[PDB]
Design an enzyme around this catalytic site. Structure first.
Site, PDB file in Angstrom:
ATOM      1  N   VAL A  90      65.240  33.120   7.064  1.00 57.11           N
ATOM      2  CA  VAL A  90      65.045  33.281   8.518  1.00 57.11           C
ATOM      3  C   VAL A  90      66.291  32.840   9.270  1.00 57.11           C
ATOM      4  CG1 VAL A  90      63.566  32.534  10.445  1.00 57.11           C
ATOM      5  CG2 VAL A  90      62.587  32.890   8.173  1.00 57.11           C
ATOM      6  N   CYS A  91      66.640  33.593  10.314  1.00 62.26           N
ATOM      7  CA  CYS A  91      67.718  33.224  11.194  1.00 62.26           C
ATOM      8  C   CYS A  91      67.119  32.432  12.349  1.00 62.26           C
ATOM      9  CB  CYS A  91      68.463  34.469  11.677  1.00 62.26           C
ATOM     10  SG  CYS A  91      69.926  34.050  12.624  1.00 62.26           S
ATOM     11  N   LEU A  92      67.275  31.112  12.312  1.00 64.65           N
ATOM     12  CA  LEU A  92      66.636  30.216  13.286  1.00 64.65           C
ATOM     13  C   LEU A  92      67.421  28.903  13.322  1.00 64.65           C
ATOM     14  CD1 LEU A  92      64.165  29.905  15.256  1.00 64.65           C
ATOM     15  CD2 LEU A  92      62.942  28.876  13.382  1.00 64.65           C
TER      16      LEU A  92
END
Length: 165
Positions: A90-92
């Site tokens: 995830v890009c977070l």
């Protein structure tokens, strides 16, 4: 161990109170012992959204220097979403020690944060080209695909898999 102590605290806090429909449990070693460093989790789709009805399995892997470092979080299987990489990671920013992670963040806050991302994509952080393009340029198709995904990964289906593990 610093990590193990904190992980036992996280387990206790989660068991005491956690958001309805979420799952977060340390895995089991072959003999049935608890392995605090790998958790099998799942995030329910937000009610009143195109995600509703789905239950999205996500694995957390903690390093020995947790909570200096965040767990590695990875959807399995990978999800269709603009900010989820094809691998399922995830890009977070709260998942990066060099951005917005801080050691006090709880497992509950991570899973809530990831749910909020599912509901509300970040158009500044594309992680998979096709989901991102469809989100931005063909929303009718985006919503069709997400609704189909919620049925593919229905709570009943996914819960049965998790109980069968």
């Amino acid at each position: 161990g610093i990590a193990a102590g904190r992980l036992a605290e996280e387990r206790k806090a989660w068991r005491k109170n956690h958001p309805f429909g979420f799952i977060a449990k340390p895995s089991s070693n072959p003999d049935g012992t608890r392995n605090l460093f790998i958790w099998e989790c799942a995030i329910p789709g937000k009610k009143g959204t195109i995600w509703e009805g789905g239950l999205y399995k996500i694995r957390m892997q903690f390093k020995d220097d947790y909570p200096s470092t965040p767990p590695k979080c990875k959807f399995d299987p990978p999800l269709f979403h603009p900010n989820v990489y094809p691998s399922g990671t995830v890009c977070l920013s709260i998942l990066d020690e060099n951005k917005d992670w801080k050691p006090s963040i709880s497992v509950r806050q991570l899973l809530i944060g990831i749910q909020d991302l599912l509901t509300n994509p970040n158009v500044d952080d594309p992680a998979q080209a096709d989901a991102y393009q469809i989100y931005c340029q063909n929303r009718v198709e985006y919503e069709k695909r997400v609704r189909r995904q919620a049925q593919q990964f229905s709570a009943e289906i996914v819960q049965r898999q998790m109980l069968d593990n």
